Design a protein that fits this description.
The chain is mainly alpha-helical. It has a single domain (1-130), classed as Growth Hormone, Chain: A. It has 4 helices and 2 strands; from the N terminus they run αβααβα. A two-stranded antiparallel sheet has the order 1-2. The longest helix is centred in the middle third of the chain and has 24 residues, at 72-95. It is found in: Secreted. GO terms for molecular function: cytokine activity; growth factor activity; interleukin-4 receptor binding.
Length: 130
């Protein structure tokens, strides 16, 4: 119909934003798990995913280098962190498992990572439903 797994709907909006308005912080290249969990199921892509992202927002909250540009950026980066965690929390649901070690598999400039994640979510969102 228009909302299979509730998590999705919420996720979508959360992802949507972070990418919509990118900064100089979504370029803090992280692990591009997409190029490793290729030989597994989404669940796992997501197991490592969660781990990766979690660290990202949790560790950079007070990185106060990229969020200390002028004033506007400061405020914008803060929003990103919120959304990163917000999405991570929900993500877990879809994943199905809990957590996994992280084994770098090339790098992704956050903006990109998100873009892919978002697309995926959507693909299912508007298919499984109607």
């Amino acid at each position: 119909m228009h909302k299979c797994d509730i998590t999705l709907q919420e996720i979508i909006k959360t992802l949507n934003s972070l990418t919509e308005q990118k900064t100089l912080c979504t370029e803090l290249t992280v692990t591009d798990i997409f190029a490793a969990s290729k030989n597994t199921t989404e669940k796992e892509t997501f197991c490592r995913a969660a781990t990766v992202l979690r660290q990202f927002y949790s560790h950079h909250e007070k990185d106060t280098r990229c969020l200390g540009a002028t004033a506007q950026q400061f405020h914008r980066h803060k929003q990103l962190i919120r959304f990163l965690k917000r999405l991570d929390r929900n993500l877990w649901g879809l994943a199905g498992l809990n957590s996994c070690p992280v084994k770098e598999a090339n790098q992704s400039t956050l903006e990109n990572f998100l873009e892919r994640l978002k697309t995926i979510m959507r693909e299912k969102y508007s298919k499984c439903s109607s």
